[PDB]
């Protein structure tokens, strides 16, 4: 959630104040996937140390 700051002003006496609703935002972060794969022969798996 993200937002700005309220904007004031300089006003005289008996002056109706302006509307200063702030605006909000929303950053997004997706999650990805990475993979690796190593195939070995059965002979090698039995023999190599």
């Amino acid at each position: 959630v993200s937002s700005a700051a309220v904007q004031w002003s300089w006003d005289a006496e008996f002056e109706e104040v302006s509307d200063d609703s702030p605006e909000f935002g929303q950053p997004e972060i997706p999650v990805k996937k990475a993979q690796g794969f190593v195939p070995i022969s059965i002979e090698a798996l039995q023999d190599e140390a």
Partner: protein, 49 residues
């Protein structure tokens, strides 16, 4: 009821937003009349014409 003074904390401007002022409201209620108009004597001087 006697004199009651109420303090308005916020007055509003044309656009229904605060204009930075306050207030002081006061009122009371009473009534009266004559029950028997034969228990008095009023003197009236007609200066007509």
């Amino acid at each position: 009821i006697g004199m009651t003074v109420e303090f308005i904390p916020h007055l509003f401007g044309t656009n229904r937003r605060p204009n930075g002022s306050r207030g002081w409201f006061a009122y009371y209620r009473m009534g009266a009349d004559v029950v028997n108009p034969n228990a008095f004597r009023l003197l009236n001087v007609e200066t007509a014409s």
